């Protein structure tokens, strides 16, 4: 093959799900090539929207907007709640099933959280960092040394 | 053992300036494989290029004007009727 | 898919929410379906369809796929930076 996303089964699954038989191998290699590039493309765009929200854990709104800006159709139906399973299934393996269905009535009410209000304190009077108010103690010695580096004080 | 443990230990003879090793002084006085593999660098097949007719037309027009004035003879590509569908082509570069 | 996490690893983004891989895989499936569908139409077009003139036999070389993708990126897929225009 050429790259990731093995086209022997992935692209084969796609085409044989459509209802064809004759997809030459090199064609499916090139197809894997294209779809992987599109992945990196959308992924960088949603990163651009990620680091404006100044967060790290990319959410689905990032990629949804990243679609909306590529003049590309949106994608509905992916809620954060009701998490994922990826249940297994075997055939004489495929590792796919979704057993989260069979509802008849819902009558739940969402609970509102508090509004966004701010908590000032005092920190770093004239170089020294108090630990008495809402601050850390020397517990960053336990942090992961690539992260939160340096300490001079 | 430990050849770079300390500098070369020697003394210099004051008669002939030779560097002398200490033992010669008296006589002279007399898994991750897959991480390394995962460097795919995927590509697309085709890219668009936003280029209208007007910009390139004015450019090419003024170009061939000056080209016929100073010195086909312009700087042009060359594509074969066969084996096309590729993405970059050579150039004539005829002066 | 675990390989999707492996692909996430290329861009230093190890903070996903686990809905993204489902979603992007669904997306690529949709996209390639449309692609190799209209490429099959063009493979029919070379095979000269109407209300009964000939058969429909599939080969689907790479050129047809290239055609079916260039039409999509004719109105999609943020292209190379159009600097000179700007």
């Amino acid at each position: 093959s050429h790259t990731l996303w093995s086209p022997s089964d992935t692209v084969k699954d796609a085409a044989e799900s459509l209802g064809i038989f004759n997809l030459n191998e090199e064609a499916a290699k090139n197809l894997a090539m294209d779809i992987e590039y599109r992945i990196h493309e959308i992924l960088d765009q949603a990163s651009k929207f990620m680091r404006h929200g100044k967060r790290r854990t990319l959410h689905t709104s990032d990629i949804d907007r990243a679609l909306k800006v590529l003049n590309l159709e949106p994608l509905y139906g992916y809620d954060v709640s009701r998490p994922l399973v990826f249940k297994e299934a075997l055939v004489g393996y495929v590792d796919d099933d979704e057993v989260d269905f069979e509802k008849l009535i819902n009558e739940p009410l969402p609970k509102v959280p508090r509004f966004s209000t701010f908590t000032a304190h005092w920190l770093a009077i004239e170089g020294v960092q108090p630990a008495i108010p809402q601050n850390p103690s020397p517990n960053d010695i336990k942090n992961i040394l690539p992260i939160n580096r340096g300490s001079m004080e | 053992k430990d050849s770079l443990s300390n500098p070369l230990r020697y003394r210099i003879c004051n008669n002939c300036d030779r560097p002398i090793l200490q033992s010669c002084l008296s006589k002279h006085i007399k898994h991750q494989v897959l991480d390394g593999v995962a460097k795919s660098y995927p590509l697309p097949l085709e890219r668009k290029v936003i280029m209208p007719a007007r910009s390139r037309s004015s450019f090419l027009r003024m170009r061939e004007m000056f080209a016929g004035a100073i010195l086909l003879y312009s700087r042009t590509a060359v594509i074969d009727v066969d084996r096309a569908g590729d993405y970059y082509f050579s150039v004539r570069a005829s002066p | 898919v675990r390989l999707l996490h492996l692909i996430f690893a290329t861009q230093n983004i190890y903070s996903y929410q686990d809905h993204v891989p489902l979603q992007l895989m669904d997306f690529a499936y949709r996209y390639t379906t449309g692609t190799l569908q209209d490429a099959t139409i063009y493979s029919d077009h070379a095979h000269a369809s109407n209300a009964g003139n000939a058969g429909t036999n599939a080969q689907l070389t790479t050129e047809d796929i290239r055609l079916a993708i260039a039409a999509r990126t004719n109105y999609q897929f943020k292209p190379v930076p159009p600097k000179e225009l700007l």
Binding site: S1, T3, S6 | L34, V37 | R2, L3, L6, A9, Y14
Partner: peptide, 22 residues
Amino acid sequence: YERLKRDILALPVRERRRIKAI
């Protein structure tokens, strides 16, 4: 996670295909 992820990827028989795409 990275080491365990690569080990689980090797759990699949496609470790060979992954090894060839260098």
